[PDB]
Amino acid sequence: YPDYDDFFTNTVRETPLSSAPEPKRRFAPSKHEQKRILQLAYAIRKGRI
């Protein structure tokens, strides 16, 4: 039972792990709520909600 040895985590890794860019999803208003909204409007127009 030796003391815990950190041969990798003793340093802080500055760059993010992933290199891929940020897709425009995370800057534009949600598309998924838009499907919900337009389905919600349709029921209101057709008299379901």
Binding site: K24, F27, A28, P29
Partner: protein
Amino acid sequence: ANPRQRNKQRSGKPRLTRRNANKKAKAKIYGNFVIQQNWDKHATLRQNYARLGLLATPNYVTGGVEKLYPVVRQLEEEAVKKAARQSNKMLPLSAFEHAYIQRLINKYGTEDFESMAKDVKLNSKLFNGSKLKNLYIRMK
């Protein structure tokens, strides 16, 4: 012989006679109405296809052919007719889009599709330049 078949041999219950057999069970044609009119309910399918001018198969026939002696135009005009009737693939703009592209064009000129894309307030949806032109040409 089996008890099961001896049951209805020594039983009094009439069989379930099912009348099914047809010599030359040449299946009649459904699907296309043009071919169904001009089918020959006697001749074989490979004769009928060659009679109409339709290639039964594009690949070589793995046997013999038939040597007894030592519609396609209709399908063509029908085809181009339907392509003409269902041709207007162009789509209009919904009232939202009608305002959506108008506010972008009323402020970024009309041809600077790279500038409208970079806009953060009016181009809220972050539509790329290729779709901005698509919405533009769709307006006219």
